[PDB]
Ligand binder design. Structure first.
Ligand SMILES: [Zn+2]
Ligand SMILES: [Zn+2]
Ligand SMILES: [Zn+2]
Lengths: 151, 226, 579, 573
């Protein structure tokens, strides 16, 4: 009743077989202690994943095909302070969840990124403007020519 | 009382030119009774909804109304080629009050206030011919083997008939009579709902593989899968 | 195989190609701009580009791989037989003395000891055909009484074709220890004059299987089944479908499937659900017919190709079709999972990429069908139940493997390499579990041959260009498993090792030979080999010259790279996999 | 209410108003007219409402009675049919002994000089087949027969089967002898060659060459030799010899043809001339194959191919706004466009019918623009068959004219083209025209004509139509015995229809006002019903499953008498 997460950092994380149900990859892997590689996830972030499962394994979930329970599902305050973490390592958490197909965790990390992308300043959006090419700079000049009477 | 606003008239007389059309959707219940709840009436001086563009569409959305059969019959006599009729926020629906055209597969709905059924519970009891309390007591296994517990649906009692009591005839016939409401539709998808009158009757083939699903079962329990 | 195809496309078309009034292979800087040495004209347009350190041919390379792997490991390796109608003779009589030896090689207790093994393990397979083995026991008793009758019914002839196909299936999955516990090989030893250290497991079991199938066909000669459409014909052909009868003679299997599709559609019945105005007995006939039909669509898909011109399946598992989801989940589970791969593989001949939404849905229903096989119980002594678990488990591995491979190729998302790697090792560990006792013959199924073929194709091809040592550990385990494949295959098992070898030698030929750059059109002898291998094998599949020889004896009419190409085609000609 | 009405009703046609579509209506809920609402959908009838209804009955009649159980159906039984250990090779080795080399050559040069359009639709160079006749007798001595040589063996023996089907009794008597056969056959030596012995030996030669194909393992090795052999054999009554086997081999042929996956047949500028000739060869093979696809179309033919060829109307209406090889396909494809209405009760409207007619005069002139050589029976063969088909289509077209809308004097058109077809048969009673009475296009066309003229004269007794009935009654006996029992069953049918002609006039048409009760009508119901019942294969399926055992007034009594006398199922074997 115990299976072992083996990351790319070799750190054997022996968790319970019940915990493996959050990774659809690993839960369906349970038909084949038991180890499995993870090629990408660094073991601290994997530990964060395990701790998320430690909370939410007792908890309820959406049906993952939803509309309200996907889009208008509010986040957990546990998940909020659980994942107020590094910028780049947040992407790593999301990549972990997308790897293991831990979909509610994937959504929980995802919606924080959504809250980051909206609710950012219009000033920096005016600043961070063509940080990819996306235009010809003549069009950039024409758009700036359009709105400069305000700014 | 057949009357319209001029912008909608201008829309309909210009509607024909699409040839890339899907997903017609209406909201005004008055307007709904005029334009697609065909109601038999194949003629009006303007306001003609153009049989070619009747044909072209793929799916229909109906947002917010009170009853789709405020008349005796919420028909879809025309609109041959639909696939996805979807109901958002109508209050009461009879399932029986719909004519359900030729071959569509999905019929989803949500947020309603009242649901009748296609009253199939009565039609079952013509065939096996038992009492409703025997049907609710003798004829319930309430199966939760392993795949039923994939989802919760823990507001609801997820019932199934007994494999022992019925000799596998008046079971397949029972199941085909369940089918005869559906006219081979598959996707059903019950979101947020309120006030089913009848029980919940779902054919086995359509609940296995989860082509029907329930998201927010609140005012509702007691689903049988047959 | 060539284009530039590098990372980080821009969005707007580049300024240099709009100057030159041409298209924009919108690379860094372009394969339309670094083509001409016009580098910093298009490089230092906007922002800043890095060093193009990729093996940037790789995307189009893998696209060409998918077209190739379509042609080789489904069509070319299996669904085509190199044939000449002049060298190989016809069959004048040749068969009664041939078949009746094998007929008399089987006895009645010998037959029922096979039937017991069928009852043990094969219940995952013959149940959908007919179900009750006790009625089948009754038919075996009917034939051993009818073994020397005269006024044979065509009905009983179909029952004989059925039960000998069943026996052929029993041959096809019995561990040869018990086969020698039922039989003695030496009638074959002196019936062919072959070698003497020649128990059946050295290929003679498969020869016995093929000749038992041919004996069932020899009964079909006397059936006059082309004047008599029977559903039992289709039943026995589905019994053949468990075997390597497609891999025996796929051309033969094509016409046999053709007549069975004719046979089924000659009933002109579409729903299998009963009605209120039905005989209950005829209703049960329809319900059995459903199990027959959706199984029938299975190898219909699995024999589909340019030698299969007449389609059957007219229904769609996902998202003018006919007949779908009016059917109970008992064995269309096995159809649904195949039809999923039908939705996949239609993007192999097809140039266009699949739209991503379809794949997105397919992933979700893939994980759904993970749970319906989880709804199977654990029947302990019912080995056939565990084999039945194994079948759907292998297929849900299989379509998953094919699924993530398409993500990696047409779209190249996160870890889709590593996902494919993980599924590959899942398949390997399934075969590891099969290497236990009471589980070895589970590996004799055709789908594991095809799946292992695809896996060792794509992993070897990727290993040639990418020397990731994790993938190389995978490849070593693949070859290790490849030697550990059971002996039921033989000829195709050897063609497998040939293709493995040809990839492992072309592995050398890429790595020693420099890639001839020409701006975007990258050139290499590995390219020019593989560009023409498909041309070779489609020219083989272009049977127009057979039509020429069938329109009389009218005899028809129709570089430094060439060095290395012809040297490798000398040392390894691709036509070593046809026979 | 629930499960409401469908369309505007008799009360709506009474009042010409909006139709609120209820039970009885919202129309009829207003003024209490439920009797008027329901008496639209017992005594004696007094109208001519039976005749349009009965013409619409004639369509579904003709899709079954003239079509399927009489012609395209063979009842069989798996217990009754034997196996084939005996006459497996044996009858084939007999008929391969009994044929001789000069016996081959005289048949060949019969069919060469007399049947040019056939192998023009099959092979072209029949003297390249003379080479195969030469290589046969060498290969007759051989043992280790290649697949290719056995394909040529199948081809030549299929041609040898074809030669028997059109040779007159006199020349065949000059080549052969009744008594060595009827000693081997053990049958009556007393009969001629013409009286089935040509037919029986023809069926033997068919079965042998198919057994040559069974020795070929053509299902292991498909090639177009199969399709050419099938298109040879389809010119006979082999679809009436073994319809199920013919559908099987048709399926194999479409499988073999589409195995090469070739759509257009006219090549590019830069092919091999062998390749270009090959694709054009598949051109004529394709149209002859789709013709047989149309002619063998039935519920025991589940696989269709002439649906893939587009309609001739959708191409010809644009430009209107060899030559005879494609013209055969023009006429047959035009019939294909005509007769989807056989089982469809919807009416063909009065434009595309008129489009077919107004093109059909140009098709008539194309038949007129063709020639016939009195020296070349290949050429009279070439012209006469097209001259038959044009009036065949013309008759069916005007029959649609009179049935669906009562187009004026379309009866007179029927009689006119019937005169033409009768005189075409009259011309066949001459020298170098005898075997024109042998090809089954007359066996269908005449059957439809005599059945409709019977159908008209049972009810509308026109003395011109009755004279045409007498002429076709004579023309019944004016037919060769190469058609066999399908001839005789037609004789039964020409009986039974005329016997229905007894019962209709003697008993007054009863009704309830519109439900026209007549025992004649119910006889004609059960005609279709029993035929379609035996056309179901589901009973054979339940038999194939084994342990599932197969289970089972004056207006009544006259049916009970006439059907217990006249079984409709007298039309099988
Ligand atoms: Zn450019
Ligand atoms: Zn550029
Ligand atoms: Zn009305």
């Amino acid at each position: 009743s115990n299976v072992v997460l083996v990351s790319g950092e070799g750190e054997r994380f022996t968790v319970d077989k019940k915990i493996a149900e959050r990774s659809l990859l690993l839960k369906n892997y349970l038909n084949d202690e038991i180890v499995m590689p993870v090629p990408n996830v660094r073991s601290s972030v994997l530990q964060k994943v395990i701790e998320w499962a430690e909370h939410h394994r007792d908890s309820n979930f959406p049906d993952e095909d939803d509309d309200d329970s996907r889009k208008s599902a509010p986040v957990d305050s546990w998940d909020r302070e659980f994942l107020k973490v590094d910028q780049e390592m947040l992407y790593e958490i999301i990549l972990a969840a997308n790897y293991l197909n831990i979909k509610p965790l994937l959504d929980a990390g995802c919606k924080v990124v959504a809250e980051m992308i909206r609710g950012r300043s219009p000033e920096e959006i005016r600043r961070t403007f063509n940080i990819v090419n996306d235009f010809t700079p003549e069009e950039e000049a024409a758009i700036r020519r359009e709105n400069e009477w305000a700014e | 009382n057949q009357l319209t606003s001029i912008s909608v008239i201008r829309t309909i007389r210009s509607m024909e030119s699409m040839k890339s059309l899907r997903k017609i959707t209406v909201r005004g219940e008055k307007l709904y009774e005029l334009l697609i709840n065909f109601h038999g009436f194949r003629d009006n001086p303007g306001k003609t909804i153009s049989y070619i563009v009747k044909r072209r569409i793929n799916e229909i959305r109906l947002s917010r109304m009170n009853q789709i059969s405020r008349t005796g019959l919420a028909d879809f006599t025309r609109w041959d080629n639909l696939q996805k009729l979807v109901l958002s926020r109508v209050a009461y629906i009879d399932l029986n009050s719909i004519v359900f055209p030729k071959n569509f597969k999905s019929l989803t709905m949500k947020r309603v206030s009242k649901i009748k059924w296609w009253n199939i519970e009565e039609n079952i009891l013509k065939e096996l011919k038992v009492d409703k309390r025997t049907f609710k007591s003798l004829y319930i296994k309430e199966d939760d083997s392993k795949f039923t517990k994939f989802f919760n649906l823990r507001h609801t009692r997820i019932k199934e008939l007994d494999k022992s009591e019925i000799n596998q005839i008046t079971y397949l016939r029972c199941q085909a009579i369940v089918w005869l409401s559906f006219r081979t539709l598959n996707h059903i998808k019950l979101q947020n709902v309120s006030e089913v009158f009848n029980n919940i009757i779902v054919p086995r083939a359509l609940f296995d593989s989860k082509r029907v699903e329930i998201y927010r079962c609140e005012k509702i329990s007691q689903v049988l899968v047959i | 195989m060539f284009n530039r195809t590098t990372q980080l496309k821009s969005k707007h078309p580049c300024s240099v190609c709009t100057r030159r009034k041409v298209k924009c292979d919108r690379m860094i800087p372009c394969g339309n701009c670094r083509k001409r040495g016009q580098d910093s004209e298009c490089m230092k347009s906007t922002k800043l580009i890095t060093a193009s350190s990729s093996k940037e041919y790789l995307p189009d390379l893998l696209l060409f791989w998918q077209n190739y792997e379509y042609w080789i490991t489904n069509i070319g390796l299996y669904k085509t037989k190199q044939r000449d109608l002049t060298r190989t003779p016809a069959n004048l009589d040749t068969d009664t003395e041939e078949c009746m030896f094998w007929m008399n090689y089987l006895q009645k207790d010998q037959s029922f000891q096979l039937m017991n093994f069928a009852m043990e393990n094969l219940g995952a397979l013959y149940f959908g055909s007919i179900g009750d083995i006790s009625e089948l026991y009754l038919r075996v008793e009917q034939y051993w009484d009818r073994r020397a009758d005269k006024n044979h019914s065509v009905d009983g002839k179909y029952w004989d074709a059925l039960i000998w196909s069943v026996f052929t299936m029993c041959i096809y999955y019995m561990p040869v220890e018990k086969l020698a516990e039922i039989f003695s090989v030496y009638p074959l030893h002196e019936y062919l004059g072959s070698n003497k250290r020649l128990n059946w497991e050295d290929g003679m079991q498969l020869v016995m299987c093929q000749n038992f199938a041919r004996c069932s066909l020899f009964q079909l000669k006397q059936c006059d089944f082309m004047a008599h459409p029977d559903i039992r014909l289709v039943q026995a052909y589905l019994i053949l479908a468990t075997t390597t009868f497609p891999y025996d003679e796929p051309l033969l299997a094509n016409s046999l499937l053709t007549q069975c599709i004719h046979t089924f559609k000659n009933f002109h019945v579409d729903d299998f659900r009963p009605l209120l105005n039905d005989d209950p007995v005829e209703s049960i006939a329809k319900v059995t017919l459903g199990r027959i039909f959706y199984r029938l669509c299975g190898c219909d898909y699995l024999q589909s190709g340019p030698r299969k011109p007449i389609a059957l399946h007219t229904e769609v598992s996902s998202l003018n079709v006919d007949v779908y989801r009016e059917e109970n989940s008992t064995e269309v589970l096995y159809w649904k999972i195949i039809s999923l791969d039908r939705d996949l593989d239609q993007y192999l001949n097809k140039s266009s990429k699949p739209p991503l939404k379809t794949l997105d849905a397919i992933r979700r229903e893939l994980d759904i069908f993970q749970y319906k096989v989880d709804s199977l119980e654990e029947d302990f002594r019912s080995n056939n139940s565990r084999f039945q678990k194994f079948i759907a488990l292998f297929q849900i591995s299989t379509v998953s493997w094919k699924l993530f491979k398409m993500y990696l190729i047409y779209y190249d998302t996160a870890d889709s390499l590593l996902k494919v790697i993980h599924y590959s090792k899942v398949i390997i560990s399934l075969i590891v579990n099969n290497f236990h006792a009471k589980s070895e013959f589970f590996n004799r199924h055709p789908m594991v041959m095809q799946t292992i073929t695809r896996v060792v194709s794509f992993i070897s091809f990727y290993q040639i260009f990418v020397e990731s040592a994790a993938v190389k550990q995978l490849l070593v385990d693949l070859t290790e498993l490849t030697a550990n494949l059971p002996t039921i295959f033989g000829s195709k098992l050897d063609k497998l090792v040939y293709l493995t070898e040809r990839l492992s030698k072309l592995k050398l030929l890429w790595d020693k030979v420099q890639l001839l750059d020409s701006g975007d059109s990258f050139y290499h002898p590995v390219f020019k080999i593989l560009q023409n291998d498909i041309k070779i094998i489609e020219l083989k599949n272009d049977e127009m010259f057979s039509l020429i020889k069938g329109l009389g004896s009218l005899v028809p009419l129709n570089s430094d790279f060439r060095t290395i190409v012809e040297e490798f085609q000398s040392e390894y000609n691709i036509s070593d996999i046809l026979s």
